[PDB]
């Protein structure tokens, strides 16, 4: 066991009430909103296929030119209450907001840089309006924060000289200032989700990542801090050199998910996945015909897949420059919400069930040993195979939305056929099992 000053801090999962809330929430929304919404993937007449929030990179735009977009930042249709209504109706329990993305433009009126909402035609504290509106709807707010900052020339990607070292030290102090500011201005914040922390410069400052975690924890009782922030003494990220998870939850499943048979290790720690609706667009991109766009069921599948293996899922939205949401995203949130209103009991506050995966869908476990079958693929055999772990029997099955009893037939030892409902629900649906453990 290798010695470390800046390695993991939790022994297993946190079970304090604030962490339990973070976990039980299960479903979140991600908001990527920044100056990139304005060009929306197009620069100087050329539409770039890469992620819209990286347009400065794709189009090789210098900082001063890029940040000049602030002069155009005027989201006149923005209404925080409406955004918070959209989230509440979707059935999200929390929202993660880009306080600052790689571009460096802050959505709050920071005292530490001029590149903020205050210095735009719009002027208003967007971040603050969102925090209050979301909290008024009972929705927790989590802050995304990019460490990498393309607006501060003291940023370095690596330390290759004596001068790189000095400038980077200034950069960390600046970052510290912004972080403490965010924590003090908005003390209802429940999580900091760090990104842009992969560069060798950060990896060589493991100590700073440990300090950032602790500082924010000192400021905000019960705050969660993600693993992506963290590098240890050796510069190993997420998990330390002893293989132990740093931060409060693992945060590397991004537009992908663990395999339901081969990656059961994920059930040993808290974890949160994030996803996009198109293939890889976080910020607003004007042309979604450029890649595949996911349907609501394809998204709900991923949400349930996450919970079924002990994880949260956050579904991303890229708001328009004018402050409204594009039709496809309004369609998505409505549809997710209709389904979550019906079937959410098998998502919120649910967890890994301990059953072998079957082809029809996913199991989730409730707080009082309910086992939910979430059926995404309807068998023509009209029978849903349930193989039970050693010592577990199925006593009853119920269609969740109607209460109607479902036939359960033993087929071999440790195996049942659970009947499909007599009328096809016509959408993914839930059957609830009552189970019994021996001994």
Ligand X SMILES: OC[C@@H]1[NH2+][C@@H](CO)[C@@H](O)C(O)[C@@H]1O
Residues contributing to the site for its own copies (CB under 8 A): 261, 279, 292, 295, 297-298, 301, 359-360, 375-383, 409-412, 417, 426-428
Paired with 409 in beta bridges are: 417
**Nearest of 306, 305, 316 to residue 272 by alpha carbon:** 306
The binding track of 184-203 with respect to ligand X, each residue x by CB under 6 A or -, is -----------x--------
Residue with tokens 């068998």: 379
3-state secondary structure of 315: strand
Least separation in angstroms between residue 199's CB and ligand X is 12
Does position 53 interact with ligand X (CB under 6 A)? The reply is yes
Could you say which of ligand X, its own copies, none residue 195 binds, taking C-beta under 5 to 8 angstroms by partner kind?
ligand X
Least separation in angstroms between residue 102's CB and ligand X is 6
DSSP state of 237: B
Least separation in angstroms between residue 353's CB and its own copies is 17
Does position 140 interact with ligand X (CB under 6 A)? The reply is no
Q: How far apart are CA 18 and CA 190, in angstroms?
A: 8
Q: How far apart are the first and last CA of the chain?
A: 37
Binding-site size for ligand X (CB under 6 A) equals 6
- Tell me if 247 sits within 8 A of 226, measured CB to CB: yes
Residue with tokens 């010592």: 391
Tokens describing residue 295? 């349907």
Could you say which of its own copies, ligand X, none residue 368 binds, taking C-beta under 5 to 8 angstroms by partner kind?
none
Least separation in angstroms between residue 98's CB and ligand X is 7
Q: How far apart are CA 130 and CA 132, in angstroms?
A: 5
Q: How far apart are CA 361 and CA 153, in angstroms?
A: 49
Q: Which of 282, 325, 343, 416 binds ligand X (CB under 6 A)?
A: 282
Diameter of the chain by CA atoms?
Answer: 73
- Tell me if 399 sits within 8 A of 429, measured CB to CB: yes
Question: Exposure of 221 by Cβ count < 10 A (0-12 exposed, 13-18 middle, 19+ buried)?
Answer: exposed
Q: Which of 4, 29, 51, 299 binds ligand X (CB under 6 A)?
A: 51
Nearer to its own copies by Cβ, of 111 and 256: the residue is 256
Nearer to ligand X by Cβ, of 88 and 228: the residue is 228
Could you say which of ligand X, its own copies, none residue 282 binds, taking C-beta under 5 to 8 angstroms by partner kind?
ligand X
3-state secondary structure of 154: coil
The binding track of 253-272 with respect to ligand X, each residue x by CB under 6 A or -, is -x------------------
Nearer to its own copies by Cβ, of 199 and 427: the residue is 427
Could you say which of its own copies, ligand X, none residue 51 binds, taking C-beta under 5 to 8 angstroms by partner kind?
ligand X
Least separation in angstroms between residue 50's CB and its own copies is 15
- The binding site for ligand X (CB under 6 A) comprises 51, 53, 195, 254, 274, 282
């Amino acid at each position: 066991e290798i010695p470390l000053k800046y390695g993991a801090t939790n022994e297993g999962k946190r079970q304090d009430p604030a962490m339990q809330k973070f976990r039980d929430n299960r479903l979140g929304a991600f908001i990527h909103w920044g100056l990139y919404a304005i060009p929306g993937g197009e620069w100087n007449g050329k539409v770039y296929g890469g992620a819209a929030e990286w347009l400065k990179s794709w189009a090789k735009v210098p900082a001063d030119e890029w940040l000049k977009l602030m002069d155009q930042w005027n989201p006149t249709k923005f209404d925080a209450k409406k955004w918070a209504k959209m989230a509440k109706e979707m059935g999200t329990k929390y929202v993660k907001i880009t306080t600052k993305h790689h571009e460096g433009f802050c959505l709050w009126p920071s005292k530490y840089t001029k590149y903020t909402v205050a210095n735009t035609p719009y002027k208003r504290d967007i971040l603050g309006e969102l925090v209050k509106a979301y909290n008024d709807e009972g929705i927790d707010v989590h802050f995304y924060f990019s460490v990498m900052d393309w607006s501060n020339p003291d940023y370095r990607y690596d330390i290759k000289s004596k001068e790189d070292s000095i400038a980077f030290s200034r950069f960390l102090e600046f970052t510290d200032n912004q972080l403490k500011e965010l924590a003090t201005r908005y003390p209802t914040v429940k999580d900091f989700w760090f990104d842009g922390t992969w560069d060798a410069s950060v990896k060589k400052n493991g100590w700073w990542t440990a300090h950032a975690e602790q500082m924010l924890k000192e400021l905000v009782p019960g705050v969660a801090i993600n693993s992506r922030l963290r590098a240890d003494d050796k510069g190993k990220r997420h998990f330390d050199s002893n293989g132990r998870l740093m931060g409060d939850y693992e945060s590397g499943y991004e537009r992908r998910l663990p395999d339901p048979v081969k990656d059961l290790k994920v059930t040993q720690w808290d974890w949160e996945a994030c996803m996009t609706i198109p293939e890889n667009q976080w910020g607003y991109h004007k042309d979604w015909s450029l890649s595949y766009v996911k349907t609501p069921i394809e998204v709900i599948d991923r949400i349930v897949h996450a919970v079924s293996m002990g994880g949260n899922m956050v579904v991303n939205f890229g708001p328009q420059a004018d402050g409204d949401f594009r039709p496809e995203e309004k369609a998505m949130a409505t549809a997710i919400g209709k389904w979550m209103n019906r079937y959410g009991k098998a998502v919120y506050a649910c967890d890994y069930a301990g059953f072998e995966k079957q082809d029809w869908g996913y199991y989730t476990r409730g707080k009082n040993d309910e086992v939910y079958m979430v059926v995404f693929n309807q068998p023509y055999s009209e029978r849903l195979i349930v193989k039970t772990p050693k010592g577990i029997t199925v006593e009853k099955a119920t269609l969740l939305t109607t209460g109607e009893d479902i036939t359960v037939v033993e087929t071999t030892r440790n195996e049942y056929n659970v009947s499909v409902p007599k009328k096809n629900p016509g959408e993914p649906y839930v059957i609830q099992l009552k189970v019994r453990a021996a001994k």
